[PDB]
RNA sequence: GUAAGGUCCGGUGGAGCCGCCGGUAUCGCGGAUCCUGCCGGGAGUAGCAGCGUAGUCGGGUGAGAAUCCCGACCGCCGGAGGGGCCAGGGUUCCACGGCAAUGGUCGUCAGCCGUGGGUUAGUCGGUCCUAACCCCGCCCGUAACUCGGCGCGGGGGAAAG
RNA sequence: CUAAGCCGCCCGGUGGAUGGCUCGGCUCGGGGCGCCGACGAAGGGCGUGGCAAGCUGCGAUAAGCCCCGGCGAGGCGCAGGCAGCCGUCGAACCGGGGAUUCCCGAAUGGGACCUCCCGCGGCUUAUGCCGCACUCCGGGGUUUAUCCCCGGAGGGGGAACGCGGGGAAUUGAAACAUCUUAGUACCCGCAGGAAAAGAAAGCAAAAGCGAUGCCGUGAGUAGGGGCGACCGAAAACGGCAGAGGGCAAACUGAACCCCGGGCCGACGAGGUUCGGGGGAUGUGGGGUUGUAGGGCCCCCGUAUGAGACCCUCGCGGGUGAAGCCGAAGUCCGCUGGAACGCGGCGCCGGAGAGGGUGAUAGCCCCGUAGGCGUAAGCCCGCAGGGUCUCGGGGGACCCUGAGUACCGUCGGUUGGAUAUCCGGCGGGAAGCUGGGAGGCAUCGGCUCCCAACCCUAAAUACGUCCCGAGACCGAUAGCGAACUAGUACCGUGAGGGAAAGCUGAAAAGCACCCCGGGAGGGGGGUGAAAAGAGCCUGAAACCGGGCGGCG
């Protein structure tokens, strides 16, 4: 995902996306040791970095909200 | 260097020389100058005196002698310089030479004067040297050509800096090694009128 | 040995995971330059540090 | 871009450990006379879309497009500059960019056009 | 531990599959810092099932493995199919 | 060339090197029971006995069998060479696939190599208590301390109590 | 046509010398830069890659996440592979600013035979967050228990340098005790980017100088010493750098300081007000010195002026990252696998330093000679707003540091010798009509000075780091480490500590055939050359075969 499209959504949507990506990462990690014919061996890395982006941007949004409120 | 190892001496009894050896396997010898990896017996030391002193009057006399030897036809030719087309020795040029600050103009002037052959000789004799100096940055052993001595710098240094083996020196900063590189006197030199006047004033 | 603390068990686990051979693709990538690592261990000859 | 030291050890160390943004500049090649007259510039870094003519080596006089650029190895791949394997397969010969001259430029990049404008 | 951070991956070994088929037990490699209550809550919330029992162990490689036995009203085969284990 | 050595010829080698003048130096080796590395004779020799002298027949596997597998016979231990389980070891445990090296010989075998696995507790043990003893705070001594110490307050201390 | 054996040459094996190379060491005048930590340091443990073991980097967001800027088409570490993915909406990379940052560790709520465990109070619905060590400082409350609460400190680390204390022996004296080694090794405590010292109760006597520190020299001198071995300065003079200030008291007497809030001013400087904590056992004002200075009193004069500093609501300039520009052949013939070589014809040059490129290149590329740009930050200036400072004569009154100076004795230390400095013990003043020093003690003269309170930049010392350089080494050398090196490995433990670089221009890293269980062997291919990965050259010793001679 891209930082612009991540910033386009709100905190609740970011949280739901984070949960979905964590579950999907667990499923891919299971399939990695289950199967052998992996079409895309970069799914795990991409999912991890999207989770990192989502968490970073959500924390940035929280900081901005606190700064605006204060 | 070579003194960081902790050793113990086996001593007599065992059929080995009484040499300091390590206290851990495989117990090599160490710390002694005849052991691999040990200290050197007499290494170079930074406290050694390398500077050499010379009396001021002796240096002045040597400089005067080198200046005199500059104007000798036999010495200049014997050094190796090409003076076939040189009008006379010493070569005196007008003070207008000090204002030339373009290398092409300097090349034309030198061709007219007759030292371009010496510059070509210096370029041809320069080349790659032999030994480990190439590792340390001394790959080329460059030769020396004409030396331009002027009374004032008005751009001649920039004009003639790039010519191979050519040094432009103001008369006030002239030294013995400028006139006799490698302890060999008789370097081809080009003086100016102002430089000659300063030589007359100083007499050395 | 039967009763083990968790920290010591984890350290032994790290050593056990360390003890393995160099990957064949690593050898191919390095062009027969990297063939082994200094952490190879035989349980009966070379003992653990702890 | 700035190697002031005259020590060969430091020059070679800089060349070997140069960052990628410096290896980008370290892959320039001379332009042809026509392109030089047209653009008022002497050389440009080699891109993939460029067409070059090899000036040194076993493939001197051969012209072709660029198919790969390796900044890490300081090498380029030119179509037609190939070796034959024992099994009959084509492989590319890596050529230093200083051994080729660019005869056709790929100018689809605004930043490359900005480079030309800066250097002209 | 917060759920969705507990489970690292499933276990897809022959013993794991036999346990899934026979004893209604799933098996997950989970975070070492997670406890039995954390594992139970994570599985229940994630898979919308009721957990009967949870057993845990620490593998010789340092990972934590959890056997989660589901209640008879819920089938572990369906969860395995959802997760791709089959 | 008295000589320390120099220079040419033939071959290998594939990238640097030398004459002369003047300086400079970790500047010349057969020994130091010298140091480091490599390699000889001893030698295809000793050892592979002593305290528990154990194998044979038929079959199987495999390119290959005294040494691996099954059956029978014959033997050894049998108040331990049997059963259980601490400390210590830390994967040596299990299956499959193997024999370049390891195994005092061989090996298709293995505590060896490779690839996959394996340790599930309200009741078993730690966790609780205190013993000998130890630590921390105050206090005192010391030039001082991470050093020495009585007394007060707190804590720890047993996987066979 | 002699079996073993011996010597010499050739071929092959074993081995790894020599030669050439070098992203690593070593040493330096100069320049730069120098502390981190309870807002949780350094050092460690454990995790983290699709295939991932070591090193490196990161921390459950785990070889990475976000934002402004530079570069401009590739990128995914050491590390030449498979499959994929990221990048034109500007990546990789680079300068700056942010986010995450497990556990142990000063480790800090309480415990550690295992870097793992066990609690109590508030909020929170719950998830979850905060607080709770000890020794103190400034405050509040009460239960007056040093009990609770608010605010703030210290702890630990750092290669060398620094400051303050404790302090040997081997050794030399050709033995050895005073002495030397030596105020050394080492131990303990305390700071910083420097530290310490620093403004005369001094140095000197025809004359005088005028804080401290460092360099040259004084000088192996004065002087100490079984006057044995040895030890050993200062002043003056020539230099680098230069800078001086504040308390206590006399006098006055709350005119005062800190914390928090408000108002004017600009948001700042500055001005003003309220509450709380200090303060008459003295906050603030004033004053800091010798043929005396200051206080107080008296007298004359002055300010109308001059000067210094503070601040930036604003403006201008300079400097300041990544970075950008920056001339000239890749022309003809020859050799060559490949021209940087040879011969011929040209060009630039404020650029002929150095490096790469299939040979040795001023003109192929990077660069160099010379110029340009740069956010934050820093500096200077303009303009405006404020605060503060500034004169001479006389006196008869007052003040100018106490277990201190100093004396005797004892121990240490010193060149300090009846004449160094420090400490213990027993004594112990004057105090402005005063006091100290001038190398044995006292008396007189003369000269210099004012202790017993405090601060102070520059010139200096070092290098865990950086720039730059070299008559240093060139893989048994140079640091121990050119490389997954303080690693592997040894010891219970303090602690000890290796070996190990090189294919080729390009993997073009040998397709296919015969044999072998395999390892491999023979053909056949690639390459200028097998240089064949057991890879540049391949020496000697040693081993096998062939040849010549003896046998």
Curated annotation (Swiss-Prot), chain A:
InterPro entries: Ribosomal_uL29, Ribosomal_uL29_CS, Ribosomal_uL29_sf. Transmembrane segments: none annotated. Keywords: Ribonucleoprotein, Ribosomal protein. One of its GO terms (biological process) is translation. One of its GO terms (cellular component) is ribosome. One of its GO terms (molecular function) is structural constituent of ribosome. CDD domains: Ribosomal_L29_HIP. Part of the 50S ribosomal subunit. Belongs to the universal ribosomal protein uL29 family. This is Large ribosomal subunit protein uL29. It comes from Pyrococcus furiosus (strain ATCC 43587 / DSM 3638 / JCM 8422 / Vc1). The gene is rpl29.
Curated annotation (Swiss-Prot), chain B:
The keyword Ribosomal protein applies. The keyword rRNA-binding applies. GO terms for molecular function: rRNA binding; structural constituent of ribosome. It comes from the Archaea. Keywords: Ribonucleoprotein, Ribosomal protein, RNA-binding, rRNA-binding. GO terms for biological process: translation. GO terms for cellular component: ribonucleoprotein complex; ribosome. Belongs to the universal ribosomal protein uL4 family. One of the primary rRNA binding proteins, this protein initially binds near the 5'-end of the 23S rRNA. It is important during the early stages of 50S assembly. It makes multiple contacts with different domains of the 23S rRNA in the assembled 50S subunit and ribosome. Forms part of the polypeptide exit tunnel. Part of the 50S ribosomal subunit. This is Large ribosomal subunit protein uL4. It comes from Pyrococcus furiosus (strain ATCC 43587 / DSM 3638 / JCM 8422 / Vc1).
UniProtKB/Swiss-Prot annotation, chain C:
GO terms for cellular component: ribonucleoprotein complex; ribosome. The keyword Ribosomal protein applies. InterPro entries: Ribosomal_eL39, Ribosomal_eL39_CS, Ribosomal_eL39_dom_sf. HAMAP family: Ribosomal_eL39. Belongs to the eukaryotic ribosomal protein eL39 family. GO terms for molecular function: structural constituent of ribosome. This is Large ribosomal subunit protein eL39. Keywords: Ribonucleoprotein, Ribosomal protein. Disulfide bonds: none annotated.
From Swiss-Prot, chain E:
GO terms for molecular function: rRNA binding; structural constituent of ribosome. Pfam families: Ribosomal_L23 (PF00276). Keywords: Ribonucleoprotein, Ribosomal protein, RNA-binding, rRNA-binding. Gene3D superfamilies: 3.30.70.330. Transmembrane segments: none annotated. Part of the 50S ribosomal subunit. Contacts protein L29. Binds to 23S rRNA. One of the proteins that surrounds the polypeptide exit tunnel on the outside of the ribosome. NCBIfam families: PRK14548.1, uL23_arch. This is Large ribosomal subunit protein uL23. It comes from Pyrococcus furiosus (strain ATCC 43587 / DSM 3638 / JCM 8422 / Vc1).
